[PDB]
C-alpha cells in the first residue's frame, strides 16, 4: 500500500513472471526501473470509488479529513468540492534519495509535504528545502497544456506525501465553476515552490 | 490474475488504512462487487514508456501476444507491433463478472484468448463469444467518447487481452500509414460491435 515505488516494483516484478522473461532482461529491466524512478512518473490514476453512488461516497468521505485539504487555499470551497477532491487524493511514502520529480518531465500532479523534507535542485544547485505542510505545483493548472517541470525534487528524509493528479482536479474544478476561480487567483500564493518553466 | 481480484485488494487496503468502520466497509464491497466491470477497472499504467528503445525492443521479443495475431495487424510495421506489444494488458475473468456494463464510455479494445461470454442487450442474449473473437467499436481513431450499447459478461472463465483506447490512439498516431488501414481493415475482423 504505502510506497509507489515498491507498488510499481512488484508490478514490474509481476509482468516479468508472467513473461517468463530471462534473468538477464529482467535484471537489466529492474536496473533501469530504479535508475528512471519518480513518483510523478509512477502516480496511481486509479478512481476506485468512482461510480459508488452519492451516499455512499459522502458517507467515506465524511471519515476522511486529508491534510492536503486543511490548507487557507480550500478555505472557500463548498463541501461537495472538497468532497469530492477528498476522494481521489492519494499519497506515497518516499525515502531519502528518491526522485519526486525529475527535471523537464511534465508535472502530473500536485504534491503536499505530510512529514520529512524534500530539496528542489536546479542541475546540481540546490534552489529549495521543502518540510511539513508545503505544496509543490504550477500556477496555471487549469489549461489542458502540458507542464514542464522546471527542476528536480527528491526526498532529503524519508517523506509522506499526498498529491491529486493534474486530471482528476481539473475534473473537479469544472463541476465547481466559482471556486475554480478562486483556486486559480490563490494557488500562486499557498505554493510554496512553482515548477512551471517559464 | 485477475483485475477484479486486484482491485478488490485495492480497496480493502483503503478501508483498512482509513480505518473505516466495518458496516461502511460492507457497504463498500458489496456496492464493489455490483458494479464491477472490468472495462472501468482497466489498467492504464505504463510501466515500460521510459525504458531505453534498445531495452524496449528485447522485452517486445519475448512477447507474441495473441490479439495482435490478427489480420487486421497483417500490414503493420515492425515499430507499430512492438508499440502495440509492449501496452497489451491481460486481465482473467469469472463466470458472471461483466467486462462491459452498457451505456459506459468504451475504454479498452478487448480481446478473447478462451472462454465463453455473452453479449446481453436489456434481458436479450444477442451473441456468444468465444476464441480468437474481437469486441470493439468502429470510431476508435476519433478522440470522443463512445458509449456502449451492451453488455458483455463472462459465461465461464475467460482470458483477455485489451489495449486501452487512449493507448490505441497514441501508438496509431506515430503509425499514420498503417492507422488508414487499421480504421478501415477492422471490420472484417470486428467480431462485435459497441458503438450506440
Redesign the interface.
Known amino acids: 500500500?504505502r510506497s509507489l515505488y515498491h507498488t510499481?516494483t512488484k508490478?514490474?516484478k509481476?509482468?516479468i513472471r508472467?513473461?517468463r522473461?530471462?534473468k538477464a532482461?529482467a535484471q537489466?529491466?529492474l536496473e533501469?526501473?530504479q535508475t528512471?524512478w519518480s513518483v510523478n512518473?509512477?502516480i496511481d490514476?486509479?478512481e476506485?470509488l468512482?461510480?459508488?453512488?452519492d451516499e455512499?461516497r459522502a458517507?467515506?468521505a465524511m471519515?476522511?479529513n486529508k491534510e492536503l485539504l486543511q490548507l487557507p487555499l480550500f478555505e472557500s470551497a463548498s463541501r461537495g468540492c472538497l468532497r469530492s477532491l477528498s476522494l481521489i487524493i492519494k499519497t506515497s511514502f518516499c525515502a531519502p534519495g528518491e526522485f519526486l520529480i525529475r527535471q523537464g518531465d511534465a508535472l502530473q500532479a500536485i504534491y503536499f509535504v505530510c512529514s520529512g523534507s524534500m530539496e528542489v535542485l536546479k542541475d546540481n544547485t540546490v534552489l529549495a528545502i521543502l518540510g511539513k505542510g508545503d505544496l509543490i505545483g504550477s500556477d496555471s493548472l487549469t489549461k489542458e497544456q502540458v507542464i514542464k517541470t522546471n527542476a528536480n525534487v527528491k526526498a532529503l528524509t524519508y517523506c509522506d506525501l499526498q498529491y491529486i493528479s493534474l486530471k482528476g482536479l481539473r475534473e473537479v474544478l469544472r463541476l465547481y465553476p466559482e471556486y475554480a476561480q478562486k483556486f486559480v487567483s490563490e494557488i500562486q500564493h499557498d505554493l510554496t515552490y512553482n515548477l512551471r518553466e517559464g
Open positions: 500500500r510499481r508490478d514490474l509481476d509482468f508472467v513473461h522473461l530471462p532482461l537489466r529491466m533501469c526501473f528512471t512518473n509512477g490514476v486509479s476506485l468512482k461510480d459508488f453512488p455512499l458517507d467515506i471519515h476522511l
